[PDB]
Q: What sequence folds into this?
C-alpha cells in the first residue's frame, strides 16, 4: 500500500500502448487501476497538503485518458462526472472541457456542449478547426 | 496535443 507508487507509471505506459493499438476497453482497465493506486495513496495524505495536491495532479491526465476510452466506447455518464470533478478544481483544463463538451453533445445537452466548446476556444484558439467540426455537427442536430 | 490522443 505504498510500494506501488512505482507501479503507476508502468501501468500508465501499458494503458497508453493498449490505447494506441486500438485495445481501448483494456486500456480503460489499466487507467482505472493506475487511478485506484494513486487515490489510495492520496487517501493517506491530508487534503490540501503538497503531497495530496501532487497526487491529485498525477491523477488528472490518467483520469482524462480513462474518459477518452469511455468516449470511444460511447459511455458518456462517467465522462460527464469525471470531467466536471477535474474542472471544479482546475478550471483551465482544455481537454476536460473538450471531452465534457463531446459527452454533453452525445447526450443532447446542446447548451452545455456549446458552453464547454466555447471555453475550449477561449483557452486555446488554435483548436478552432476541430471545435468548429464538433459545433457544426451539434448545430445540424439543433436544426433538427 | 490532439484531443483524441492520450496524455
A:
Amino acid at each position: 500500500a505504498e510500494e506501488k507508487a512505482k507501479a503507476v507509471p508502468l501501468i500508465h505506459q501499458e494503458g497508453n500502448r493498449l490505447y494506441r493499438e486500438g485495445h481501448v476497453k483494456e486500456a480503460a482497465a489499466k487507467y482505472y487501476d493506475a487511478i485506484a493506486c494513486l487515490k489510495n495513496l492520496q487517501m493517506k495524505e491530508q487534503p490540501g497538503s503538497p503531497e495530496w495536491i501532487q497526487l491529485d495532479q498525477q491523477i488528472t491526465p490518467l483520469l482524462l485518458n480513462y474518459c477518452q476510452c469511455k468516449l470511444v466506447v460511447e459511455e458518456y455518464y462517467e465522462v460527464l462526472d469525471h470531467c466536471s470533478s477535474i474542472l471544479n478544481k482546475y478550471d483551465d483544463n482544455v481537454k476536460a472541457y473538450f471531452k465534457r463538451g463531446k459527452a454533453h453533445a452525445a447526450v443532447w445537452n446542446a447548451q452545455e456542449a456549446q458552453a464547454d466548446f466555447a471555453k475550449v476556444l477561449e483557452l486555446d484558439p488554435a483548436l478552432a478547426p476541430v471545435v468548429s467540426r464538433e459545433l457544426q455537427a451539434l448545430e445540424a442536430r439543433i436544426r433538427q | 496535443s490532439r484531443m483524441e490522443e492520450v496524455d
User: Anything to note?
Assistant: The domain at 1-144 of chain A is CATH 1.25.40.10 (Serine Threonine Protein Phosphatase 5, Tetratricopeptide repeat). Chain A touches chain B at residues 15-16, 19-20, 27, 61, 64-65, 68, 95, 98-99, 127, 130 (CB under 8 Å). The first helix of chain A runs from residue 7 to 21.
